[PDB]
């Protein structure tokens, strides 16, 4: 009685229950060899200056620069006012403002009616 | 006010007539004397404001803003002494002249009795500011940040000029004292809806209002350190100061015209405060923190209650010393690693023990730790808005939680954790840097002992 | 120093564009 | 000697007498003797010396008295030199009345602590004044906004008077 | 870090100790003023409405 | 979505984009006298026939 | 009351001496942990005189 | 190359030539003086004397004068049996209501 | 990746450790530890890939169902209470270069030796870089391993940051 | 932290002291260089248990990527002394 492990976006599939880890062919083994080749080609370039004794400063990391550039400067040129963006923008953008506007107008309209009729308690209210 | 205008002008001869290696010493020393003499403006009375002449006056709203403005100038000179060292001598002097020219316009802006003399100087603090951003930045984006900083402000200011001249044609004058006794109610008509929208739009761009704020993450980020300090500490308060005055002649239309801006500010608080949670740039994270803090200022000003006005004045002063400190702190790291990315240098508390203390104090003031004046002002605006509508306590509360998250996240991300291995050029903190932070934080905490001098004319 | 070719760009459509992107990101043309 | 005793009333003191029904020594009394000999004595001697130095050089400061001037119900429209006089007067009164409420609040707060558990019954007099002064303050200095002025206060007063003179007719015309 | 803190302590106390001593002497040997009714037919100067000696000095010299 | 895309897309970018398009129309001219003067005739006729500036 | 009031605040002030003294470099290192411990000891006694006066 | 340009200069550490540097200037003689003016004028003139000046300001916005005046009125009001505070701020005899 | 032999070796150690969590007591753990080893020896000889993979993959499912919700973790192992408890003291050694000379004179012997190591590092660098340019394939390295020193007067390539690293209990 | 500092002699003794308490190794043919597979005749599954007993002995965990690569009584001493920073 071993129920399957159902995964969610917040609970990744264990590497020991993933079928891809137990049906391995020659092509996958070759692929894993060149994943380690890049992981080893990039490592040395970091090491050839990490260990350099005449180096004082910051080792520029292009991967870091691209990450920050993608988050800030490369968003608008890749923006297309398609159907998804227009609905999401109107919903997230204009939605809350219109929602809160009527939450406060109704609350203030209700409160104004009482204060003009005397049935609102303001006995000790002299700080506003 | 001539006792402050002339000495400010005399710094320019001092810089241009000093020995080549004493430009910073002489300018810094005498700019500190002008700050010392600025305390003479605290002769305020409880009924009548200090009226020097037909042109200049000084009430309790502009007195702390004059004291703050004159006190940052020595701090801007200290902050600029590193990245300008390998610069031409004639260009170093011109840089200092722009800062001095900026101060000269600011101390006349906060003291102008006429609203058109105010406008001319209020709009004159764009040439010295724009030139600093564009000529003494570091990235290619300074030029595009100058254009955004320029055409956002002018697009709002020009209608204000038409509106002020229209008011002069009808009321008879734009002297602020006269307007108090000649003010008339603003009847509800489509014409007055657009007079209202021209008397408040120029100021809300500079606050800035959510939506009209895309120039702040650009200008405050791309500008030099001195530009960042003045931009985020004295130049965002021009809109706040003008609004506190221009709302005098916009009653009772402000009762219903304020909703779309109270709603943008209240909801703009959460959005801007949430962006900080996910910023890759340390300097940009601090820039958005000003949009979230100044949102309360707009809400407080608009709802027009004696408690809100007291809070807005305290918030503006408190935000001035805190944002400047954070930019200076973020600039200390930048001058070592030459990168604004917040995840590049970590664990700096292990290498800079004292500088990590300054980070804590700035962060604690930013998240409104009581009894700092960052909390007195923020507390007052919350009390005022609760009486305005009890539901606003929810939006204010959420902002406090998000504010604590991004303030400590900035501290933890850069100071704690394991230091970056390949960063081996973290020089011990200079006396200039330590003294620069001590000049921000010590005045901020001392004000907690005598807070009455920053609560404005409603005290 | 980082140049234009070392920075993220538009969505890659043609297979050659995919390979250029993958090489730029230090991935494999298959993983990317 | 000290603060006037009429603004801040003080109920007469009533100290129970010591009635020791135990042979053991009382720690408080022995501690009290030590405090009055190691703390109260040198403090008194130091204060007396300091007080003597004042007697040699005695100088006085006075309480500014503001001559009453015409109020905002006597200034012609757009006459600034008269409104300015009236507005400053109204501002000083606004500040003084802000302090009257504070004094009455201090009376109410002192009563609650002084009366201890029996504060609900024995602090009704102060609570009765606080309810009346606050109402008076709320009538003349409330809902005026951050840009308050003698004109706005007058406008509120007349609106209140009109409704009082209006509802009185229907209420009184039985 | 130690050197800066030493300099901060030195310069804070450079004009702080004289002020702490100066304020102590002024209070001890000059004391504050005593409230009294304004004598009839007399116009006090604007700085005589303030209690502490330093408050009066500020008013008389600068304000 | 709301700070790098849409708040940029409505006010700054669209306003800036339109000015570029307007600028091209005004300046994309062929430099021929025959066509410049032909427009002067249109303005004169439009002034008198449409706007009645001659009355 | 004179004794109750003075000894209630001295308890609070006594706990701030180690912080104040350590700020202006007016202590001896390697003895601070024992300095703070002793201050808590005397603060405890001073807090019992108001307590006994309340119990009475 | 695409042009003739200088190389990115290395940042010069100020603790190499002058290991006692305050970080102000690369000249040790002027480096100390820039430190003295900042510390003296900054800390010993503005923060110390300025705080002392602020502490002993003449009555600021007459918040202490308002107290003395209120004590008089409450005394006079209660001594002669008058309301502590009248709900009308302006005498309703110099006011001419409409209608 | 990990060979099928490696996977069983890991699943054996990990299975024992979680079993130790449940049993706690040594006598109880020992009794069920020998039984657990019994279930491995019996199938330890079969050499059919389908049967080997099927047995291992099925063993993983049983382990993930019977695992302890809160297994024992060694104090300094990842996830433990004392993990990284001393990373706030591991100041890198290059920080010593910026010490003021007035405090470098408190340790005249130590900094004297530090100069020997710093000199011993400048001399041996150019040789190390050359060695990696002659033992490296055309394109680039394909494995994460460094060669040893093949001649007297040569230290292992890329040794400074593995030798001069901070200690486990710096203070 | 008020604990004895490990020594090269001490680590070696305890490692041998443990292997001399395993009922698959001869306590009189065991030297500090006796291979666990060829000079002593044990399988890998018995090698996993040896590392566990050593890791339980010294109160820390040896990673699998390094546990399987250590097959000698000396490789367990040069490894532990390397992790615990023992030089004499
Ligand atoms: C009454 C009850 C109701 C009200 C209560 C209000 C108070 C409660 C506030 C609520 C918050 C609670 C406190 C939260 C603390 C958070 C920070 C923290 O935990 O760490 C303490 C924090 C840092 O401690 P640390 O982690 O050990 O870092 C030390 C460094 O690593 C270096 O270590 P070091 O060993 O080498 O040297 C230590 C020290 C050595 O210090 C020095 O050597 C030089 C320090 C000189 C101090 C100068 C004082 C300011 C000068 C004003 C000028 C006046 C002149 C007039 C003089 C008198 C004559 C008139 O260096 C420093 O710490 C530098 C800090 C400089 C800022 C100190 C704060 C200044 C406050 C100014 C007064 C304002 C008080 C109002 C309240 C403010 C809000 C809390 O220090 C404090 O601020 C403690 C005091 C605050 C309480
Ligand atoms: C820890 C210490 C605990 C408190 C110690 C008790 C003494 C005390 O604190 O009270 C004394 C006073 C307040 O106490 P006080 O006002 O209640 O009483 C003082 C003495 N009498 C009774 C006579 C009035 O502290 C201060 O007033 C200090 C205020 C300093 C304000 C800042 C001045 C520096 C400005 C330089 C420019 C910097 C830029 C600023 C920009 C913003 C300008 C608005
Ligand atoms: C007190 C009781 C607390 C019970 C909480 C129950 C709410 C659980 C919501 C949830 O599980 O959504 C998780 C969702 C990611 O889940 P996903 O991978 O898409 O697959 C579906 C698995 N829920 O995460 C998401 O991104 C969407 C969340 C859905 C909205 C949840 C609102 C609550
Ligand atoms: C106001 C209502 C907006 C919501 C209605 C949107 C209607 C819509 O669906 O538009 C879809 C339209 C077509 O898109 P599509 O066919 O997929 O591809 C071709 C795109 N040229 O897509 C379009 O291209 C239309 C143009 C984009 C829509 C612009 C109108 C504003 C969109 C909402 C932005 C609101 C942001 C305001 C934020 C302020 C507060 C932060
Ligand atoms: C209160 C309410 C406040 C609301 C304010 C909203 C913001 C106002 C608009 C912000 C304008 C931002 C300026 C920066 C524009 C920009 O980034 O450049 C884009 C584009 C590029 O042109 P360029 O720089 O010359 O090419 C070389 C580039 N390396 O540049 C262009 O192609 C054209 C740029 C010129 C147009 C911008 C200047 C005019 C802006 C004011 C409105 C103009 C109204 C025109 C009259 C109405 C039309 C009938
Ligand atoms: C989006 C791009 C902007 C386009 C939308 C805004 C355009 C609004 C149209 C202009 C305003 C219309 C107007 O002229 O207001 C009417 C009134 C003038 O009529 P008036 O002579 O005063 O009548 C009574 C005189 N006894 O006005 C007055 O009474 C004088 C008050 C000053 C009016 C000038 C300012 C107009 C508002 C400009 C927009 C405000 C928002 C700023 C946006 C940047 C542009
Ligand atoms: C975000 C990027 C853009 C940033 C720039 C934003 C510029 C916003 C423009 C502000 C001007 C909006 C007002 C337009 C209508 C003109 C004012 C008006 O006519 O209102 C009159 C109306 C009468 O008052 P009444 O509600 O009946 O109460 C009794 C009063 N005696 O009074 C009222 O009804 C009060 C309600 C005023 C209008 C409420 C609108 C709320 C809309 C949601 C919030 C804003 C949405 C985002 C704005 C567009 C973007
Ligand atoms: C002698 C002796 O020590 O014991 C005498 C005492 C009997 O005395 P007594 O009860 O008065 O005899 C009857 C007289 N009518 O015998 C007793 O029973 C005395 C009992 C002990 C009383 C002393 C208690 C210790 C003192 C504590 C002082 C602080 C208060 C405790 C801490 C408060 C914390 C909240
Ligand atoms: C447009 C409305 C129009 O046709 O104008 C009618 C206008 C009113 O007529 P009337 O009753 O006589 O009032 C006279 C008061 N002076 O009397 C008129 O005839 C005035 C007509 C003026 C027409 C001006 C149209 C050109 C300006 C609009 C902007 C053009 C934008 C294109 C620019 C080129 C871009 C490439
Ligand atoms: C009334 C207000 C009075 C204000 C007085 C002015 C404020 C003080 C001016 C600034 C003080 C200063 O900077 O002095 C520096 C001066 C250095 O001058 P110097 O010796 O020529 O240069 C040596 C560099 N190696 O130091 C000395 O020469 C000594
Ligand atoms: C006092 C005193 O004596 O000032 C002492 C100090 C000098 O300090 P020092 O005693 O030489 O050593 C201590 C300093 N260290 C640690 C570097 C060695 O003055 C200064 O820095 C003065 C700075 C220049 C200001 C001169 C003009 C003053 C004008 C005042 C107008 C209000
Ligand atoms: Zn630098």
Short description:
The PDB classes it as membrane protein. The structure is cut from a larger assembly and holds 10 protein chains of 9 kinds. Chain C is mainly alpha-helical and 32 residues long.
Specify Rg of chain C, calculated over alpha carbons: 9 Å
Q: Approximately what portion of the residues of chain C adopt beta-strand conformation?
A: under 5%
Q: Separation of termini of chain C?
A: 24 Å
Helix content of chain B: 55-70%
Rounded Rg of chain B: 21 Å
The total count of helices of chain B amounts to 20
Helix content of chain C: 25-40%
Strand content of chain B: under 5%
Note the overall shape of chain C: globular
Number of helices, counting only DSSP H or I runs of 4 residues or more of chain C? 1
Shape descriptor of chain B reads: globular
Compute the number of strand runs of chain C: 0
- Attached small molecules: cardiolipin, 1,2-diacyl-SN-glycero-3-phosphocholine, 1,2-Distearoyl-sn-glycerophosphoethanolamine, diundecyl phosphatidyl choline, zinc ion
Order of helices and strands of chain C, N to C?
H
Tally the beta strands of chain B. Answer: 2
By secondary-structure content and strand pairing, the structural class of chain C works out as mainly alpha
Strand order of the largest sheet of chain B: 1-2
One letter per element, helices H and strands E, the order of chain B comes to HHEEHHHHHHHHHHHHHHHHHH
Membrane topology (chain H): Single-pass membrane protein
Subunit structure (chain H): Complex I is composed of 45 different subunits. Interacts with BCAP31.
Transmembrane segments (chain H): 37-57
Biased composition (Basic and acidic residues) (chain H): 14-25
Could you please describe the fold and organization of this structure?
This is part of a larger assembly, with 10 protein chains of 9 kinds. Chain E is mostly helical and 63 residues long. Chain E has 3 helices and 1 strand; from the N terminus they run ααβα. Chain E has helices at residues 2-14, 16-29, 53-61, and one strand at 34-35. Chain E is elongated and about 65 Å long. In chain I, α1 runs parallel beside α3 (49-66). With 171 residues, chain I is an all-alpha fold. The longest helix of chain I has 20 residues, at 4-23. Helix content of chain J is 45%, strand content 0%. The two termini of chain J are 19 Å apart. It is classed as membrane protein. Keywords: Oxidoreductase, Membrane-bound, metabolism. Inward-facing, open1 proteoliposome complex I at 2.9 A. Initially purified in LMNG. Chain A: NADH dehydrogenase [ubiquinone] 1 beta subcomplex subunit 4.
